[PDB]
Ligand binder design. Structure first.
Ligand SMILES: [Mg+2]
Length: 375
């Protein structure tokens, strides 16, 4: 007599019989948190390969339930979106697990990358806004428990490997939920050492100068060549389109083509911006030569975004911009291996630094931007 499964775009929801909406929630990851493999292998041999992680679990869940916490699961299962794990098989496993746990659960399943994939808060928002009958949930009185907690190697005998991910801790961080690992929570073990990602999205503002030094000017009244340098996905093209192309700069993009073109623009009295990655000295030298040959100045706009800032931005645009071209990790690390910072010795008249800043986004999108989006 359960409401049962609901299948949405990039989300599955199960509401067991006996589920009641509540103003506080005790939520859990599934794999590595409530269950683990019965086979003792790192990854399951089959849908049947599971057991309850610790015998202490059902008792704790009963206690929570009697105290009025709505019991919830937030589980990433991208295998489903990748077509590696049938949704209909996974639904059966969840129902079996829920039988064994023996308490009413509401389960949310993130089948794909994006807004619903922990650590992004899409599943919380769905629970609160769509699946709790409109009862506001107090985050401070709630709790999320999960094994992707960013723990270092060896936090326990036989744990010679760090957590595969920090997605569960960061999910709780994004939502504002108190957090605990399965061992801390069910076993009362002392807190384990953990790391957070070096780039913290909450510390990214729209303040500060557009470029440095501020005494410089973005535009030149005369012909010139501007060489843009920085990670793909960092927002260079957007910056270039907005500030130079809109001012009549000619947009060169070597991929779609390079020198003769740059030269042709200069003879016409035009100014040119080379909107590419241009990670190293040989890459850039083509354009400096062109400028030198034409006798026009060559400047570099050096975009400060780190690799993690660029990857964060890429993920954000993947979630919010229908026209965004996804930058692959292959391209990111390839750029990083090639990268040599620009210097004046290369033949640049000057180098402007373009600090990485928050774009001009609506309130909701700014809130999304400050969320960690990868474990
Ligand atoms: Mg897990």
């Amino acid at each position: 007599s359960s409401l049962g499964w609901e299948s949405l775009k990039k989300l599955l929801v199960f509401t067991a019989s006996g589920v009641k909406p509540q103003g506080k929630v005790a939520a859990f990851a599934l794999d590595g948190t409530l269950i683990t493999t019965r086979s003792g292998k790192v990854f399951p041999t089959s849908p049947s390969d599971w057991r309850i992680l610790y015998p202490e679990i059902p008792k704790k869940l009963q206690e929570l339930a009697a105290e009025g916490y709505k019991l919830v699961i937030f589980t990433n299962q991208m295998g489903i979106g990748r077509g590696k794990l049938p949704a209909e098989v996974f639904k059966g496993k969840v129902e079996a697990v829920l039988e064994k746990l023996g308490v009413p659960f509401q389960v949310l399943v993130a089948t794909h990358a994006g807004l619903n994939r922990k650590p992004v808060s899409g599943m919380w928002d769905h629970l609160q806004e769509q699946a709790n009958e409109g009862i506001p949930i107090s985050v401070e009185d709630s709790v999320f428990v999960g094994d992707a907690a960013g723990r270092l190697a060896n936090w326990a005998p036989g744990r010679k490997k760090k957590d595969f991910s920090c997605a569960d801790r960061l999910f709780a961080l994004n939502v504002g939920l108190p957090f605990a690992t399965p061992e801390e929570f069910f076993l009362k073990w002392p807190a384990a050492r953990f790391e957070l990602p070096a780039f913290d999205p909450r510390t990214i503002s729209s303040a500060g100068p557009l470029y440095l030094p501020e005494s410089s000017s973005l535009l030149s009244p005369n012909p010139e060549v501007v060489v843009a340098v920085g990670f793909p996905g960092a927002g260079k093209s957007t910056f270039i389109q907005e500030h130079l192309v809109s001012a009549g700069y000619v947009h060169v993009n070597r991929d779609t083509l390079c020198v003769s073109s740059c030269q042709a623009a200069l003879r016409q009295g035009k100014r040119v911006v080379i909107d590419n990655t241009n990670p190293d000295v040989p890459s850039r030298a083509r354009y400096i030569q062109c400028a030198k040959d034409a006798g026009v100045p060559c400047r570099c706009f050096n975009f400060c975004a780190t690799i993690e800032q660029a990857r964060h931005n890429n993920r954000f645009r993947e979630m919010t911009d229908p026209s965004h071209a996804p930058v692959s990790d292959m391209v990111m690390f390839s750029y990083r291996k090639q990268f040599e910072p620009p210097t004046l010795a290369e033949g640049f008249l000057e180098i402007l630094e373009i600090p990485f800043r928050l774009q001009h986004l609506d309130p909701a999108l700014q809130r999304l931007y400050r969320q960690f989006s990868e474990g």
